[PDB]
């Protein structure tokens, strides 16, 4: 059982899954509407979105007293985010501007990756070592999609038996994708291309929001139960409540370095020879140079105009 990091609107909290009966520790307090949360363990960073302050912020959790730092601002509805701990990038969704965007860990070099055919984008999960990103959209045409972390090769992997796909997580050991649907009340899994789909928890989940994973156990927050639930990732058995009486549970992660497995950054020490952004890519050489929004990449594929 790992530590579980979750957003709670008014704060961010850390609870030990093996001892969830106790009160959670507050990692960050004094927030308005903290929704999405993630981390870069090796950098000692925790990131969150606040939908009321229209921003993504970060804090250094390895400093006795580090302040809240605004990294990205002017985000109308930053409903989901994910940290690329390999390429050192921040990814997020905005369900009001209907966009998916990337930036450096400090918020510099913002680049809009997708801005079309998004209605209610929500959850976003990264597989940095394979250069793929995954997201849900619970809008008029609900779906799960994946694309290169460089904005390449977008395509829909799930578009049936889906309505409110709120939670999304990856199993890096088994190469599987898991998601929770809050209208259809279930958790399903599949291969990373969407094939070989199967049910984990068949039904009876009141309103699951965010989903995470550690070893053989799935963990998720539920808006109606105001709690964190758990079950076996293979059979869906052992369904149990880990941590209860939560003010307003939101996004959640298994908070462990093991959930961010070390790998070689294909960018190297060279930033891939990229003038600006060096993004993870699903195709060799597994990185791709990119530029801030509206800025053109020159003929060499490395230098921004």
């Amino acid at each position: 059982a790992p530590l579980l990091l979750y957003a709670n609107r008014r704060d961010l909290r850390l609870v030990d899954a093996t001892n969830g009966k106790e009160n959670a520790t507050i990692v960050v307090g004094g927030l308005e509407d903290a929704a999405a949360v993630d981390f870069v363990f090796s950098h000692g960073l925790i990131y969150w979105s606040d939908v009321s302050e229209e921003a993504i912020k970060r804090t250094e959790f390895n400093k006795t007293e580090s302040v809240q730092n605004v990294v990205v601002s002017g985000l109308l509805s930053p409903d989901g985010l994910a940290c690329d701990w390999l390429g050192e990038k921040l990814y997020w969704t905005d369900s009001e501007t209907n966009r998916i965007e990337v930036s450096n860990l400090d918020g510099s070099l913002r680049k809009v990756l997708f801005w079309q055919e998004l209605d209610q984008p929500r959850a976003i999960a990264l597989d940095p070592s394979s250069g793929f990103m995954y997201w849900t959209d619970w809008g008029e045409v609900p779906k799960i999609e994946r694309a290169g972390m460089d904005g390449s090769s977008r395509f829909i992997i799930i578009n049936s038996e889906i309505y409110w796909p709120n939670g999304l997580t990856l199993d890096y050991e088994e190469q599987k994708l898991y998601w929770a649907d809050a209208k259809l009340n279930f958790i399903h899994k599949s291969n990373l291309d969407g094939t070989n789909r199967q049910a984990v928890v068949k039904g009876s989940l009141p309103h699951p929001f965010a989903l995470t994973l550690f070893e053989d156990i799935l963990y998720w927050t539920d808006w109606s139960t105001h709690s964190i639930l758990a079950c076996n990732k293979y059979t869906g058995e052992g369904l149990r409540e880990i941590h209860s009486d939560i003010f307003s549970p939101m996004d959640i992660h298994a908070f462990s370095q093991q959930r961010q497995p070390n790998a070689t950054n294909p960018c190297g020490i060279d930033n891939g020879g990229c003038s600006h952004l060096c993004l993870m890519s699903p195709v060799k050489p597994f990185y791709q140079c990119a530029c801030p929004t509206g800025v053109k990449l020159l003929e060499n594929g490395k230098t921004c105009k």
């Binding site: 929704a35 939908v51 509805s77 809050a182 209208k183 309103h207 808006w223 109606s224 939101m250």
Partner: peptide
Amino acid sequence: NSNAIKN
């Protein structure tokens, strides 16, 4: 149930 984050 409403599924919006803001409400």
